[PDB]
Every structure is written in structure tokens, then in C-alpha cells.
Symmetry: D2
Subunit: 310 residues, 4 copies
């Protein structure tokens, strides 16, 4: 009834509470708060048109603060207003929102992609490029003698997998994560080219910018990212079914193919959730589970990485 | 980076760490251990063919014990052997396994169904039977004047939902959760009708028994249970889309339909995972996530129950 | 550009136009018409409260008739009214509808289940019971010498599959397909106990009856049937992966495992569509594709039946 | 029991046998034959390193020919050899295969994308750009007076949909469909730079080429294409739920939202099948149903295009 890695319900928090740990900074109740205040703060650095203290000095303590300092206010939304206003101990009192809220989502997605998914995919690709250039010459399949279909080398056929994985690498990554902006207030600022303060802003967050107009943050480049991870994830399950399978056959002489079964296990689950979330039409419940389907691929990766080493 | 309801990755452990709390006793790393030792212990009460101390006095402390007292032994499986053997401080030393391992899975599923899913479904049905017999006379749809299609009362059309929910109640519940049994050891027991010690045993666990032979614990009555929850879950999303929808229209005069959107949200996710797990062909990774898809329906229920009250 | 088995788009009409042929009588544009007029005619046999000519003498010719004799009328629905009224060449002129429309759907589903799905499942079960009692003694897996996991006989492990298939047989079949009834017209009939003419009617169609009230033909016992076929279908894919797999290994000496791959192929597609349709919330588009997901299992069956014979 | 649009089982062949007609040239048993002989013939134009008669003069008649002239030969595969060899009535007798077989699949996919999916998407985008610039000024939602959430114009919010659709247009289309090549025979040709005859060849088919090596036609750019159509398809269902929905509200005064329900209907089915096929790991059964999930989007499009006009 407590709540730890032992008594957790989902494995991403439980069995694999850690090393999947990195998602805690991004998709937990904390994560998305940590992300939303940053941005809505990095903008108030707006005041420079006239430092980064709390965007960095922020933890579960001020996420708990914003949590306790909600559930009292008579407006439901804009609880974040009073917190940032609390840590004001000046005439900074401008709390515009909304497009900023998208930038949040973009940034968390952006960070997931660049600082976890990709670094994982790269370990996985590399370990496949080794296990191939090591199994060069090791023949496969066909049908002994008296039948062919197709004869190759387990190594060359593992090279293709690394190559397929390489394409979904490039495919992730070229998924465009966009953003843009555009009160009776901001006319305290008569000296700025607001398109520009905006382009400068968005960009400063490492988001790609702006127009064609500014209206549609269709806001499902999530679909695009997730159909891609799941494309990669499927490539990996294919890889999983090769090792476990080859070591099914190398059990005709005299290693535990566990890990390749697990990796398969979790990948089917990533994909399940990932796809689900990707085809669902503020998406706060979709938003609150962006990290789950991702949490599942990390397990699969740490598990494939684990097999191999063997 | 810590690990609590704030920094959890999945919402079942995080935002809804609690009241979904009850799954912690069943599907966590703890749960399934708690379940596997019970059974493999309630059998050793076998020795009665000649009390329930630790099956009851068991917690995260001895799940941590079995966890630390694994990862050292040179056999990987049967870590559970040494623990039960440790708490032996007599000639009880018979540690048969396997069919017992199925009984574990049956029992946890059994307990989930009888002590959480059903008590939840019943709250949900009741609250639908109220909101109907309260909205009697409230008309709906058709098309004002100049068009019909079909005209009823929001209340009678909510009665059907309660009735549909009633059928999936009966349908869950009549899903049969089976079990059976059948060393050079047990010939210390020359005085028992083993079929009978077995039928008595299985049954004593409240599992339904035995033969036609004993060979196939096909072991996916999980499919059967899960296609049923997800049938119910879909009925509820239908209900969700009625309230949110009616209160879309009752916003033509002068309540937050949040909760009915959430309930919808999580139910689509239960179903996603639930179905996934149900169509996957020892299933330890499937096993380790039996509680997730279920964890998601509980949120949906607590959320529908929450709307209504309004 | 023509339209035959060669130039068809979907395989159920194309490659397997035939032997899957039997669905043409049920789920085609024809089928559901054939079904809706029957019922809405077998009722007019109502006039007996005072023979079966066209319910039997009905073909593509009068389905074409009802098709041409639609697309002209200025009401869209009730095109079926004018056709039955045409073949009136007396004072039978009472054309009540609606609950009758459900009975149609029930009956087509009913007929699919009793006259095609089940007769197929039974062939499939039998052929598994042979291939098992023929492979008795043939050992399997484990890991030669120096490793076990679990050692059995390919035959006993095929018996379980037949047994699992047997349970989903019984499970289909006990899915309840319900129906019920209940103008200023029918008061030409002052001499009938209408509840009774109704119970007699429904029942006469071999539908199970009536009340608890009469309001909710929840009308997704389709879900229930389809989660069941797909449960069975998955059992079969499991079987498929055993033969293709065993004959992967029996290719260590000196038959084409095609058919077991195909059967797998189509079953994944049945299930895809079947599940889809089952979780979708008049369902005319769902209605118009009830036979597709089913069309796909038949291929899988004819294909598994085909392998085996080998 | 015959086989036409009336008695077809699937709607793509049946109710919508036509205008979906165009897929008959591509994904039917005919299609893929028509495609495989072309290519394996356009190559024999190889002999130019020393016209297009039958690649153009090919119909159901020679697909029937290749069908009858199979089922007799004692090799199962290479039935296509004897047919092309039949229509030899010179020393052209070189029948290399395999990489050519991929080029076939690429080309059919290529043609589907450029000559049907895209021309459809473009009609759909345009009709959305009209229905928006026509509904400019028409306000929406919020909550009359006493509640907001967010207030816009049905027209501007339809512009975003056209814009979202535009991105998946560009996204399809930039999906790379690749190909490459590389007997004791071709040493009748000592005068050609074979890499080049190959690059020239592939390219001549409008396939993108070649190396990085030539080994992995991973051969699921199908995944990539299909996650994209289904991304678009989902955008459209979103659009569907806007019109049907707005005309739910415009039924508060005094048109049939059918078509927008249908389009929704079929799109969920495309996506179901499309996704299915996309996540399945020679794929002849996957291959034989490439046109189904696509057949379903066309209906959805012809249906959305149909609503609108209203």
C-alpha cells in the first residue's frame, strides 16, 4: 500500500524504476510542470527588453508547492499564476499564456527525442553493428541440403537491421516540432518588433518557428514521432526474433534468450500505447501519458542492450 | 529523479497513485510475489495430512528480502525456494512448483475480479441508474421541429447503458478461472488420495477445478476477462459521450464536463493495453503488466463516479 | 477495370472468391437485403392470425430490383416498402419496421455463427485432434542435452490447442443473440395477445427473446461474438506457429510450410478488422463490413485445413 | 453465390465497386501480376544494349493465362517464366528475378501514391479550403454567455484542418520508395557498365536508386507510407466530426450528415487495416492486401467529397 519500485503497479516505475529514471524529469506530474514554468518563465526574461535562477533551482519541492497551492483557488486553471507570482519577492506582473503552453509540449517532446530516445537508438544501432561484424561468415537457414529458398550470413542480415534502424534514426529527428506566437498589456513595450521577439523566443527554446501563418499548432507531430519510434521499435522486435531464434538453433549442441523475449515483450507494449496515443483525436489525458509508451521502449532497449553481452 | 506520485512516469502510480492504490497489493513486483508464496505455502499446509502465520504477516519487507536474496544464487529461478527455506527456523522441506505457479496467476486475477473490478462496476452501474431515474422526462435529440430520426428521454436511454453494463457484469464473473494439479518425494505421503488433496486444494483457493484432463491451463481466460472489461469499458465511454454531450447542449442557457473526458481518456488507454495483452501469444512480461490496463479503468471509473455529483 | 476474382481488390472476393463463397448469401449488399425482407416478410405471415413464396424465391434479381427501385424515391429510407408493396399483385398493407430491423441483424449473425463459423471451427478442431494423435511420441524442444526448461510430446501439446479451441467453441454459441418487440394500425387485430405474437415471432426466427424490458437491444453481442472468434483465431495462429516451426526443425534432415504462414497472415487480418468493428461505438458502415473480418478467418481456416494433408 | 457488386462480401468491391475501381489495376490478383511482368519485361528491353508491346497490351486475358498456365507446373514458383517464354513467338531467354520482384512492389506502391492517394487528398484539401472560406465569420462553441473556454470562427478552424492535411500531403510524397540491383549468364553482355545499366534501370521506372550498399530493401517504406495516410485519415475523421457536429447544432432551427458519418466509418477501417499491415513483420499475404486499407480511404474520401455539396 506504500509506493515504491516494489509496490508500483506499472513496471516503468516499478521493476525498471531506474535507468528509465530519466523520464521522471519530463513526463511525470513534475516533468510537465517543470517544463511549463520554464518557457512561461524564459519569456519573462522578456524584461531584458528593458537571471535563470528558478528555471534551474526547481524540484519536487516547488512542484509540491504548486500542487498544494492549487486545490484551494476558485478558478481551477491559472494555479501556476499564483506560484510564479509568489516567488516574486517585481513589476514583472504580466502572465500571458496558451501558445506558451504549446511551446511547453514541444520542448518536452524535443528533449525526450534528443536526450533519451536518440542516445538509446544509437546504443542499439551500435550493438547491432558489432553483433553483425562478429557473426560475419556464420551461415543461416535455407534448408541444410535438398532445399534452399534463400541462403545468407547471420551478420550481413544483421547489417540490414542496423541499416533499417539508421533510416528510422534519420526519420525521427527530421520530424518537425513547430511553434509560434500570435494583451492590452504588452503596450508597456512600444519599442520591440514583436514578430522577432517571438521568432527569437521560440527559436531560443530550440523550437522551429512560426508562420505560414500562426494558427495551427496541429500539435500532432506526436503522431509523426510516435509512428516513427514504433517503426523503429518493430525493426528491433524483428532483431529480437533473430537472436532468440538463432540461439534457438545454437541449442542443437550444448546463454539465456531471456532479454530478447523481454525486449520483445515491452516493445509490443510501447507500440500498443504509443500507437494508441498517436491515433487519439487540450489533450490532458493524452498529455499525461506521453511518457508511458516511451517508458516501455527504454526497457526494451536496456534489455536488448543487455542480451548482446552474450 | 527520486520516485513518488509527483515524479512517477505512468499516471496509475503518479497522479492516481492512490485509490488505484488497491492494485499495489496484487500486480506490483510485491503483489505477484505475495501471491506466489501464498499458494506455494497454503499447500505446505499439506503437512496437515499428518498456522497461516507468514501468508498473512508478509509485506514489502519480505518481498525486499526475496529480492536481495535473489541476484546472488547461481540458478536464477527457485530464489523463492531459499526464502521460504530461510523462514524455516521443519522437515517441511518439500518444494514442488509449476502447476502451483498457475494457481498463483489464477488467484491474483480472481482477486482483482472479485474485490476491485466488480465493486467498481457496481458503483458505476448504480450511479448510472440514478442519473437515469432523475433525468426521466428530460427529452433529447431528434431535430427540434421539421426533422425526427428518433425521439426518446435522456434517462430511458441511460437505463439501457445501465442494462448493457449489467450484462457485462454477469459476463465477467462467469469467466471461468481454472486450475489443476498433475515427485519421487510425495511418497512420504502413502495415506492420501492425491486427486482430492489436489481437488480440495485448488478449490480451497476458490479456484475452479481440475480435469477433463490436467494438461491445458490454456491460461488465457485472460483474453476472456479482458475482452470483457473492455466490452464494459466501451459501454462506459459511450455513457461518457452522453453526459459530455448533453452538457454540451445544456450549455445553450447559462458544470465542468471534465471527468467525462478523462474517464474517456483513461478507458481508451485501458482498452489499448488490455487488448494488447489479451492478444499476445511463462508470459513474464505480459504477467508483469496485468495491472496496468486495469489500473487505467479504475481511473476512468473514479472519474466517471466523480462527474455525476453534478 | 471489369470486376471478377482476377480484378477484385480484397482477397475474400478475389483470390478466395469461392468456398468463402458462402458469405455472399449473408454479408453482401444482397445478403443483408435478403435478410431484412425475410423477417419483415415472415412477420406479415402475421396475416395467419386470420405461403413462404418470395422469402425463398429471392435472388440478385430482386436485390437489383430493390436497388433500381431505390435512388428514385423522395424519402431515402423505406425503399423496401415499395418493393414488397410491388410484389403485392392484398389488404396486407401494414409495413411496421425498426425492432424488425434488429431481428434482421441478429438472424444474419445467427446464421453466420451456426452455419459457417462453427462448421469451420469443428473441421479445424478435428484436424488438430488427428495431427496430435499421430504426433504422439514425437518429442520436442527443451535443449538437446545440457539444458531443459520443459520437455513434452508434439501431439500432447497439440491436444491442448484442440482443447483450447473447444472452449472457444463452447464460448461462441453461448453468446446470446437477443430480440424483442415493443401502430394505430394493429387495432385491425383485436384478437391476439401481442406479447406472444411477439414472443412467438422472435422465437420462430430462432432468436432468443424479449423482455427484462424491451428497450435495449444494446446490439453489441457483436463485440461478444467477435472477441470470441478472435480468441479462437489467436489459438489457431498459435497452432500455425507450431507446425511451421516444427517443420522448421524437420528441415534438419532432407513439405511447404506455406499455408501455415497464410493462415497466420489472414487470421491477423480477421482479428484486425473484427476487433476494429467490435470496438466501434444505425451502424450501417459497421453493418456493411460484418463479413469482412469473418471472410478473413475462413481463408485462414481453409488454409490451415489445407496444410495438414502433409 | 454469383460474384458482383451486389453479392460481393467487402464493400470496396461491392457497394463501392466503382470509382474505387482504379485499385483494380494495381492491387488485385491482376494488378500485382500486371506490375510484376512489366519490370521483369522492361528490363529485357535490356536487349537494347545490342517495343513496349505487351507491357501495354496486357489484361485479365493474360492474367487468366498466367493463372491457368500455373497450377500445372512442378516447381510452384517461376510460373511467370513460362508465360513470358510463351509470348516469345527470341534469344531473349534470360529470366533473372528477385530484386526485380522488389521493384514491382515499389512501383505499385509508387503508382498508388502518385496517381490515386494524392489526387484524392488534393480534392479533399481543396473542398476543405472552400468550406472554410465560406464559413468565415460563422462563430462557434465557447458557451453562449457566462462561459468561454475558447471562441473562434468555423472557417478559420477549418483552415487549420486544410493546413494539417497539407503537411501530411508533403509528408506522403517525401516517403522514399527505394530500389537497387546486385548470373553466369549476363556474361553475354561484356560491353555494359552493369552499375549504370542498373541505376539507369531502377530510375527509368521512376524508383529512387541504389546503394549505400545494395542489400537492404528493408522494404517497409510501407509502414512509412501507411503511418502517413493514417495520419491524414485521422485529420479527415477530425474534419468529419466537425461538420457532423456543426450540422448537429444547425439542427436548432429547421441536410443529411450521412456521408460524414460514412467517411468516418470507412476511415477507421482503412486505418485499422493499414495500421495492421504496417506493423506486421516474401510478405505475400501482406502483399495481397495492400489495397484493402487503401480501398477504404477512397470510400471515405468520395464520401467526404460527397457531403460538402450541402
Amino acid at each position: 500500500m506504500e509506493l515504491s519500485s516494489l509496490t508500483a503497479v506499472s513496471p516503468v516505475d516499478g521493476r525498471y524504476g531506474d535507468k528509465v529514471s530519466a523520464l521522471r524529469g519530463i513526463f511525470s506530474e513534475y516533468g510537465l510542470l517543470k517544463f511549463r514554468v520554464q518557457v512561461e518563465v524564459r519569456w519573462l526574461q522578456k524584461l531584458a527588453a528593458h537571471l535563470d535562477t528558478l528555471v534551474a533551482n526547481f524540484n519536487e519541492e516547488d512542484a509540491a508547492r504548486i500542487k498544494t497551492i492549487e486545490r484551494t483557488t476558485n478558478h481551477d486553471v491559472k494555479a501556476v499564476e499564483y506560484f510564479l507570482k509568489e516567488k516574486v519577492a517585481f513589476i514583472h506582473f504580466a502572465c500571458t499564456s496558451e501558445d506558451i503552453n504549446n511551446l511547453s509540449h514541444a520542448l518536452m517532446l524535443k528533449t525526450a527525442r534528443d536526450e533519451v530516445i536518440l542516445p538509446y537508438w544509437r546504443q542499439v544501432i551500435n550493438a547491432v553493428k558489432d553483433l553483425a561484424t562478429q557473426y560475419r561468415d556464420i551461415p543461416l537457414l535455407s534448408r541444410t541440403h535438398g532445399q534452399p529458398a534463400t541462403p545468407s550470413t547471420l551478420g550481413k542480415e544483421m547489417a540490414n537491421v542496423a541499416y533499417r534502424m539508421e533510416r528510422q534514426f534519420r526519420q525521427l529527428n527530421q520530424v518537425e516540432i513547430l511553434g509560434k506566437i500570435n494583451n492590452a498589456h504588452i503596450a508597456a513595450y512600444p519599442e520591440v518588433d514583436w514578430h522577432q521577439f517571438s521568432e527569437e523566443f521560440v527559436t531560443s527554446l530550440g523550437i522551429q518557428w512560426n508562420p505560414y501563418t500562426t494558427q495551427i499548432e496541429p500539435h500532432d507531430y506526436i503522431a509523426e514521432l510516435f509512428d516513427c519510434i514504433a517503426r523503429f521499435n518493430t525493426i528491433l522486435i524483428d532483431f529480437d526474433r533473430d537472436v532468440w531464434g538463432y540461439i534457438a538453433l545454437n541449442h542443437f549442441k550444448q546463454v539465456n534468450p531471456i532479454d530478447f523475449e523481454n525486449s520483445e515483450g515491452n516493445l509490443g507494449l510501447s507500440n500498443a500505447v504509443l500507437h494508441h496515443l498517436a491515433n487519439k483525436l487540450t489533450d490532458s489525458t493524452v498529455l499525461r501519458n506521453l511518457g508511458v509508451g516511451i517508458g516501455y521502449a527504454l526497457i526494451a532497449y536496456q534489455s536488448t542492450l543487455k542480451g548482446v553481452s552474450k
